[PDB]
Design a protein around this ligand. Structure first.
Ligand SMILES: OC[C@H]1O[C@@H](O)[C@H](O)[C@@H](O)[C@@H]1O
Ligand SMILES: [Mg+2]
Length: 339
C-alpha cells in the first residue's frame, strides 16, 4: 500500500528544475560553483516567480563532489551545505513541493563499475546521511532523489540503460540511499525517497531489472525527453510536431505502465522538456501530447530549465532569471495549464 506517496504527489500541478545552478561543477570547493556555468545566484524572488506561475514543485539539482572532504567521511563543506539549505528554504517559504538530488556526481566518483559496489554505496550513504540529518525536521513536501542518471560515462550503453551487471549495482545503490536516510529518523522515517533506474532510462530491459523496495514511501524517477529527435538537436532531429510521432511517447509510456504504474508503484518524471527551435506552436502541441499522456494516470513531471534561450547551448530555458520574466509565455502556459 503506497497510497501515502500517491497522495503527496497529487498535490503537484507541475514541476520545475533549477538547472545548471547548484548542479554546476566549476569553482571547486566554493559556493561560487552556483554561478560557474553563467547563471545568477538564486534568490527568493526567482523561486517565487516559478511558484507564482503555477510550478508549485521545484527540483533543486545539486552536485556535491567538489564540496566533499576526503573519504571515508566525505564531509560536505559547511558553506555549501548552508547554501543548499538556503535554496531549499526559498521553496519551503513558499509552501512548495521540493526534490533535492545529487546530480553530476557522475563526472566524479559515481562511475557504475560493479566491481566497486562497496566504495560507491558507502560514499552515497555518507553523503545522504549528512543531507538527511540536515533536513531531518523538514516536512513531507521535501522529497529526496538519491541519484541523477547514475551510469558509466563513455560506455557503449551509457544512454541505453547500461548492462545487466550495472543494473544490479544500481539496485544496491538505491538500497544504500534508502537505508542511510531511514536510519537518521525524524521526518526522514517516512519522507518520499525517489530512486531511479540506470541513467534514469525507461527502456523495457532497464525497468524489468529494477528492484522495487519494500519501503512503502518510495517513488521511481525517470527522465523521458521523448522523443529525442524532437526535444534535442541532433542528426535526424526535427522541429515540427504534428502528432505523427506521438507513438514514441505512448509506446515508451506503455512500459512505464506495465512495470510500474499498473503495479501500484509511484512514478515521477524528474526531468523532461523540449529545446526551443523557433517552434513555439510545435512545442505547445508536443506538451499536449506528452504531459496529456502522463495526466492519464496522474503522473507528475518536472521540466528542465537551464536558463539558456537566446544564447548558445541547449535551449531549455523558460524563466529569464535576471528579468523575472518568462522567455516564452505560450510554452509556459501549456505546461502550467496542462490540467
Ligand atoms: O553553457 C552553459 C553550460 O551547459 C552545460 O551543460 C555545460 O557542461 C557547461 O559547460 C556549460 O557551461
Ligand atoms: Mg514523523
Amino acid at each position: 500500500d503506497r497510497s501515502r506517496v500517491f497522495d503527496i504527489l497529487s498535490n503537484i500541478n507541475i514541476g520545475w528544475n533549477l538547472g545548471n545552478t547548484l548542479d554546476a561543477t566549476g569553482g571547486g570547493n566554493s559556493v561560487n560553483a552556483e554561478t560557474s556555468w553563467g547563471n545568477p545566484k538564486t534568490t527568493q524572488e526567482i523561486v517565487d516567480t516559478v511558484n507564482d506561475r503555477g510550478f508549485n514543485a521545484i527540483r533543486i539539482p545539486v552536485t556535491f563532489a567538489n564540496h566533499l572532504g576526503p573519504a571515508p567521511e566525505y564531509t560536505i563543506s559547511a558553506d555549501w551545505l548552508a547554501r543548499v539549505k538556503e535554496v531549499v528554504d526559498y521553496a519551503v517559504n513558499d509552501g512548495m513541493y521540493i526534490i533535492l538530488d545529487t546530480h553530476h556526481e557522475t563526472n566524479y566518483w559515481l562511475k557504475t563499475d560493479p566491481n566497486n559496489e562497496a566504495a560507491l554505496c558507502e560514499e552515497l550513504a555518507a553523503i545522504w546521511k549528512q543531507l538527511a540529518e540536515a533536513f531531518k525536521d523538514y516536512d513531507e513536501k521535501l522529497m529526496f532523489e538519491g541519484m541523477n542518471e547514475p551510469r558509466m560515462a563513455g560506455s557503449a550503453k551509457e544512454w541505453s540503460g547500461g548492462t545487466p551487471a550495472e543494473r544490479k549495482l544500481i539496485n544496491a545503490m538505491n538500497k544504500a540511499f534508502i537505508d542511510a536516510v531511514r536510519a537518521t529518523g525524524g521526518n526522514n522515517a517516512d519522507r518520499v525517497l525517489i530512486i531511479c533506474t540506470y541513467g534514469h532510462n525507461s527502456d523495457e530491459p532497464t525497468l524489468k531489472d529494477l528492484e522495487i523496495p519494500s519501503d512503502p514511501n518510495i517513488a521511481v524517477a525517470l527522465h523521458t525527453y521523448t522523443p529525442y529527435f524532437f526535444t534535442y538537436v541532433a542528426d535526424g532531429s526535427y522541429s515540427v510536431w504534428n502528432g505523427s510521432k506521438k507513438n514514441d511517447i505512448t509506446w515508451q509510456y506503455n512500459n512505464i505502465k506495465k512495470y510500474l504504474i499498473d503495479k501500484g508503484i509511484p512514478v515521477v518524471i524528474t526531468e523532461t522538456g523540449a529545446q526551443f527551435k523557433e517552434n513555439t506552436e510545435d512545442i505547445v502541441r508536443w506538451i499536449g501530447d506528452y504531459v496529456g499522456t502522463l495526466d492519464q494516470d496522474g503522473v507528475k513531471c518536472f521540466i528542465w530549465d537551464n536558463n539558456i534561450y537566446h544564447g548558445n547551448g541547449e535551449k531549455f530555458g523558460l524563466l529569464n532569471r535576471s528579468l523575472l520574466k518568462w522567455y516564452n509565455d505560450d510554452i509556459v502556459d501549456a505546461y502550467v495549464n496542462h490540467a
